[PDB]
């Protein structure tokens, strides 16, 4: 096993990784900004290194500082968590070039999945169903681009190859708006990604967001760990995630899961990963792959018994996956509610000092958060301060436990979305299940 690792992240995910390390007897190095000295995981870590000031550019995105911290502490690996540098192929490359293990796939694989055009080509080649599209980047010939749009059939959507997670796309409903839509998407892509490449897909009207979790080791094993429905979202920010996805049968799960695992083998995938799909009229369409462990990983852990972070670390050390595909069983149901420090009317981050804190407990209740009484949520980082995960023998029990747990949760001194989460749990359409990606924003609009 890895002797010692740098946790190149903060907040709840840093604590999550620290726990997994502690379980495996791995020494921890907590790199942190000057604003994060009193983070729970920092206080629990074996060694700590202040890598810079509050702003992320000089701390959590500071590649030299992070690598230097690994060097000086004699760490052997770096876990990037999610966000920050976790999908930064150049960082992964530098980590490996510097002689440390990057907890993720090969840098070339990160780069492939970061190039949405090339990722789709690879997935399509491997037998994964994709959205009907341009199958290549759009040029500047608008006669050709109109022909592609006609072949696909309107509405279509223009997307930046360097984008993803809702970033760098726009819907086109007729020829009249096509040229300008392509030009603007391209200009925004150039400005944001220093990559002006764009592509076209059919715009699905009312899909659900359903993603598949995979794990692949360096011994050739690749497994899928069911799916997650992430359709309950606002402006591409997930709000509630659940596993399994309501209405997905064992046969569909098998069908799409096997295709994702096969794709992993074809591309030489290593580590945890997520295949994102749109799901509509009983059909899956691949849009994007993530290579990091994600925020919503805990729902998959609850329904499979697999500790995904521990698997990442075992894989990185050269150990095979601790479980075979035949040993992966979906059992029960899990729901995750993201807890955000945000204003209820604006939805802007609402930082501040927590004056009173109480976490929920009980059977099937899992609380993932670094916060504590007297902890100050800084203004410099994301608004998500914790994750409440509830498991039950079925979806109704999971939801009932969530309702109870949300009622026990006390976070005074700052504004949170606990009340909104309670409203969602009480929503009759959510209780029925299978609401589409548009549902929450429509509910909030009314
Ligand atoms: C709906 C949608 C999303 C999308 C995913 C998660 C949250 C919000 C939107 C992402 C990519 C998408 N791509 C196509 N071609 N069509 C969609 N309808 C779509």
> Rounded to whole angstroms, how far apart are CA atoms 115 and 390?
35
> Helix H segments across 128-172?
142-152
Q: Is the CB of 157 under 6 A from ligand 1?
A: yes
Torsion of CA 370, 375, 380, 383, to 10 degrees: 60
Closest CA to 273 of 256, 284, 261: 261
Which region holds residue 25: left if phi is over 0, alpha if psi is between -120 and 50, else beta?
A: left
The answer to the question of whether 201 is labelled as a binding residue is yes
DSSP string, 360-380: --STTEEEEE---TT-EE-TT
Query: What span, in angstroms and rounded, lies between the C-alpha atoms of 426 and 435?
Result: 14
In the set 10, 186, 208, 292, the catalytic residue is 292
Tokens 């992240």, located at residue = 9
Nearest CA to ligand 1 atom 18: 204
Q: Which atom of ligand 1 is nearest to the CA of 205?
A: 18
Residue 201 Cβ < 6 Å to ligand 1: yes
Best CA proximity match to 267, nearest among 291, 303, 240: 291
For 157, the enclosing helix (H) or strand (E) is strand 156-164
Structural domain range at position 177: 131-203
Last residue of a domain, one of 85, 107, 141: 85
The three-state secondary structure class of 359 is: coil
Whether residue 71 is found in the same domain as residue 113: no
Residue 58 and residue 144 in one domain: no
336 annotated as ligand-binding? no
**411 in ligand 1 pocket by Cβ < 6 Å?**
no
For helices 395-408 and 418-425, what crossing angle results, to 10°? 150
Residue 381 assigned ligand-binding role: no
Q: How many domains does the chain have?
A: 3
In three-state form (DSSP H/G/I as H, E/B as E, the rest C), the secondary structure along 301-353 is HHHHCCCHHHHHHHHHHCCCCCCCHHHCCCCCEEEEEEEEEECCCCCCECCEE
Q: Are 298 and 368 in contact (CB under 8 A)?
A: yes
Query: Which residue has the least CA distance to atom 13 on ligand 1?
Result: 203
Q: Which of 143, 175, 203 is the last residue of a domain?
A: 203
Is there a single domain that holds both residue 309 and residue 367?
A: yes
Is the same domain home to 221 and 314?
A: yes
Q: Are residues 102 and 161 in the same domain?
A: no
Which of 204, 238, 436, 440, when mutated, tests ligand 1's pocket best, judged by the most ligand atoms within 8 Å of its CB? 204
Same domain, 299 and 189: no
- Among candidate residues 137, 178, 189, 136, the one with its CA nearest the CA of residue 154: 178
User: Any idea how long the chain is?
Assistant: 446
Q: Is 61 exposed, middle or buried (0-12, 13-18, 19+ CB in 10 A)?
A: middle
Are 69 and 110 in contact, with CB atoms under 8 Å apart? no
39: annotated binding-site residue?
Answer: no
Cα of 158 vs centre of ligand 1, distance in Å, is 11
- Residue with the nearest Cα to atom 5 of ligand 1? 209
Same domain assignment for residues 391 and 243: yes
53 and 168 share one domain: no
User: What CATH number should be reported for the domain holding residue 193?
Assistant: 3.30.1490.20
Same domain? 263 vs 389: yes
Please report which residue ranges of 233-284 form alpha helices under DSSP H.
250-267
Within 8 A by CB and 6+ apart from 18, the residues are 7, 28, 30, 41, 44, 45
Ligand 1 binding pocket mutation candidate from 117, 159, 207, 275 (most atoms within 8 A of CB): 207
Q: CA end-to-end span of the chain, whole Å?
A: 53
Other beta carbons less than 10 A from residue 250's beta carbon: 10
Which technique was used to obtain these atomic coordinates? X-ray
Q: What is the CATH classification number for the domain harbouring 349?
A: 3.30.470.20
DSSP 8-state code for residue 205: S
Q: In what order do the strands lie in the sheet with 198-202?
A: 167-172, 156-164, 198-202
Last residue of a domain, which of 85, 100, 116? 85
Shared domain check, 63 and 96: no
Residue 107: CA count within 13 A, CB half-sphere: 14
Q: Is 295 annotated as a binding residue?
A: yes
Residues 105 and 47 in one domain: no
Kindly report the CA angle at 398 between 424 and 422, in degrees rounded to 5?
Answer: 25
Q: Residues 6 or more apart from 372 whose CB is under 8 A from it?
A: 40, 354, 357
Contact 200 CB / ligand 1 (< 6 Å): no
Q: Are residues 188 and 224 in the same domain?
A: no
**Resolution of this entry in Å?**
1.9
Tokens at 48, concatenated: 């700590």
Q: Is 292 a catalytic residue?
A: yes
* CATH code: domain of residue 42: 3.40.50.20
Spatial separation of the C-alpha atoms in residues 132 and 204, rounded to whole Å:
10
């Amino acid at each position: 096993m890895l002797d010692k690792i740098v946790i190149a992240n903060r907040g709840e995910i840093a604590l999550r990784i620290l726990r997994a390390c502690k379980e495996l007897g791995i020494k921890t190095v907590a790199v942190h900004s000057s604003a994060d000295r009193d983070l729970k995981h920092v206080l629990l870590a074996d060694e700590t290194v202040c890598i810079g000031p509050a702003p992320s550019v000089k701390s959590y995105l500071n590649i030299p500082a992070i690598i230097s911290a690994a060097e000086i502490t004699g760490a052997v690996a770096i876990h990037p968590g999610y966000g920050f540098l976790s999908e930064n192929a150049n960082f992964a490359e530098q980590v490996e070039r510097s002689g440390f293990i990057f907890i993720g796939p090969k840098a070339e694989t990160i780069r492939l999945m970061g190039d949405k055009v090339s990722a789709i080509a690879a997935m399509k080649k491997a037998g994964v169903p994709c959205v009907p599209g341009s199958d290549g980047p759009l040029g500047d010939d608008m006669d050709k681009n109109r022909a592609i749009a006609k072949r696909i059939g309107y509405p279509v959507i223009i997307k930046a190859s360097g984008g993803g997670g809702g970033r760098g796309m726009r819907v086109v409903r007729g020829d009249a708006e096509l040229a300008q839509s392509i030009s603007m998407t391209r200009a925004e892509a150039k400005a944001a990604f220093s990559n002006d490449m764009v592509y076209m897909e059919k715009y699905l009207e009312n899909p659900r967001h359903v993603e598949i979790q995979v794990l692949a080791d360096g011994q050739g094993n690749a497994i899928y760990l069911a799916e997650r429905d992430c359709s309950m979202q606002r402006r591409h920010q997930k709000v509630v995630e659940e596993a399994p996805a309501p209405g997905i049968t064992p046969e569909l799960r098998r069908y799409i899961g096997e295709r994702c695992a096969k794709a992993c083998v074809d591309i030489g995938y290593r580590g945890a990963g997520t295949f994102e799909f749109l799901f509509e009229n009983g059909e899956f369409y691949f849009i994007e792959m993530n290579t990091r462990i994600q925020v919503e990983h805990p729902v998959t852990e609850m329904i499979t018994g697999v500790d995904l972070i521990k698997e990442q670390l075992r894989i990185a050390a050269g150990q095979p996956l601790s479980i075979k595909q035949e040993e992966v069983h979906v059992r029960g149901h899990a729901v995750e509610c993201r807890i955000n420090a945000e204003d209820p009317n604006t939805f802007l981050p609402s930082p501040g000092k927590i004056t009173r804190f109480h976490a929920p407990g009980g059977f099937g209740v899992r609380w993932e958060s670094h916060i504590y009484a007297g902890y100050t949520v800084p203004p410099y980082y994301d608004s998500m301060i914790g994750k409440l995960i509830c498991y039950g023998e079925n979806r109704d029990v999971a939801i009932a436990r969530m309702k109870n747990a949300l009622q026990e949760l006390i976070i005074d001194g700052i504004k949170t979305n606990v009340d909104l989460q309670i409203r969602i749990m009480n929503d009759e359409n959510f209780q029925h299940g299978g609401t589409n990606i548009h549902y929450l924003e429509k509910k909030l609009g009314l």
